[PDB]
């Protein structure tokens, strides 16, 4: 758990059931009012930006969100497969997880995958790919 006034950028926290990344935080305390934290967050499960308010005494649960640089295997039109050259483990990313990236996911290539609690939710393709001109 982290305290409202520790919300530095890059912090992953659990909120109302979802994982978020802290983009920025600001201290707010209006005339005759209590102290707050105005936080700009990254709603991971949908890639959108949201803003939230917290009491300076509020806190949040750290969330499990790491970036594995797993290698892309192939997709069966529905799932995109990745593997760990060390762990030997594989993971499947659905269409919403890989999102608007399948365009550059060329068979056999290392990618940076953001997984929340093990399973992927974000796919970051190394945008230095050499592709075909069909």
């Amino acid at each position: 758990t982290y305290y409202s006034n520790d919300f530095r950028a890059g912090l992953k926290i659990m909120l109302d059931g979802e994982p978020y990344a802290v983009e920025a935080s600001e201290f707010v305390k209006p005339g005759k009012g209590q102290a707050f934290a105005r936080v700009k967050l990254r709603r991971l499960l949908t890639g959108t930006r949201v803003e939230k308010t917290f009491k300076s005494t509020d806190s949040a649960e750290g969330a499990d969100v790491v970036d594995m640089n797993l290698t892309y295997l192939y997709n069966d039109g529905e799932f995109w497969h990745f593997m760990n050259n060390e762990t030997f483990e594989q993971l499947s990313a659905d269409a919403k997880a890989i999102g608007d990236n399948a365009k550059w996911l060329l068979d056999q290539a290392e990618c940076i995958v953001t997984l929340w609690n093990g399973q992927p939710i974000s796919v970051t393709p190394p945008n230095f790919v050499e592709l075909e001109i069909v």
Binding site: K29, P30, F36
Partner: protein
């Protein structure tokens, strides 16, 4: 850049800050408003619920006695004692302290510009402030909105009648449920909605005055005689920055003492320490203070907006971080 020994404010910025200080003194000198200097330390403090002062201890020559003191959160009590003494209109550029307060626009110690005007109602005072913001910010005459119309305009809700249920869902639309659904204090709800629903959409082009805050948020202001639902309190905002808080001062010793007593009951009910009521201010109020209006403005914030700096630390020689 950032080597800690270096000042947080740039020389160029310090040069202009001084110029604005002189511009401010002149403005008052031209209006015959006397300058005074009140203490930074005191045996008394304020009961205001959300403020938490600094404490320090005075020990006399030769380690004889001892005495606890509080750093002034504002010069208001001392200046009210002075108005009663018969000082006439007066202002002050002092250093104030507030613990637990630090951020982009807050520093534990900041410069406050506070002045009192005998015989000026909330409106005549506000007009004086506007004239000051116009000269320093070089902006157009501010706009004036009532707390009531500010809510209706930006949140289509009436803070004077709506109830916890109706305004708790406005909080959900502003996505503040996490801090609202669990709040049973109507005033705290309003503040939550105001600071996050109205403040950020206010004063975009020119500064904006908001008066008649709810009576519950009167602080040391008089309650209106017309509408007992609002107080003779006002604040002014610009570019999303809160610049000053002022009001038609409450001059009834009785009522003023009751509010301080209530502040202490609210603090204890929350686990916050209770602070002894400043008897000097009370006693002076009993003697009788001139009908008047006062206001406190955050100088650091005025300078910041005038030089277009992005943070308060940029217009302060040394912010706490490196003080």
């Amino acid at each position: 850049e950032t080597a800690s020994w270096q000042p947080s404010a740039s020389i160029p910025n310090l040069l202009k800050r001084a110029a604005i200080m002189a511009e401010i003194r002149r403005f008052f000198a031209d209006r015959g408003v006397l300058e005074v200097e009140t203490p930074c330390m005191s045996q008394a403090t304020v009961t205001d619920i959300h403020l938490v002062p600094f404490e320090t201890r005075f020990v006399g020559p030769g380690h004889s006695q001892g005495m606890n003191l509080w750093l002034m959160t504002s010069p208001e009590y001392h200046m009210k004692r002075l108005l009663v003494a018969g000082c006439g209109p007066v202002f002050q550029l002092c250093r104030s302290f507030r613990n637990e307060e630090m951020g982009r626009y807050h520093n534990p110690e900041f410069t406050m510009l506070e002045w009192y005007r005998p015989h000026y109602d909330m409106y005549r005072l506000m007009n004086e402030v506007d004239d000051l913001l116009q000269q320093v910010l070089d902006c157009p005459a501010a706009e004036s909105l009532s707390y009531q119309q500010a809510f209706l305009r930006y949140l289509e809700i009436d803070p004077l009648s709506a109830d916890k249920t109706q305004l708790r869902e406005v909080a959900a639309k502003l996505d503040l449920s996490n801090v609202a659904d669990t709040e049973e204090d109507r005033d705290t709800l309003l503040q939550l909605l105001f600071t996050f629903g109205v403040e950020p959409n206010i004063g975009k082009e020119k500064p904006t005055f908001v008066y008649h805050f709810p009576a519950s948020q009167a602080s040391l202001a008089q309650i209106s005689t017309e509408d007992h639902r609002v107080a003779e309190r006002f604040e002014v905002y610009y570019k999303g920055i809160e610049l000053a808080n002022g009001f038609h001062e409450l001059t009834d010793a009785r009522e003023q003492q009751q509010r301080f007593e209530q502040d202490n009951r609210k603090r204890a009910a929350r686990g916050l320490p209770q602070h002894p009521i400043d008897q000097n201010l009370i006693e002076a109020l009993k003697v009788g203070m001139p009908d008047c209006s006062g206001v406190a403005l955050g100088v650091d914030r005025l300078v910041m907006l005038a030089l277009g700096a992005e943070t308060l630390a940029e217009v302060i020689a040394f912010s706490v971080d490196r003080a």
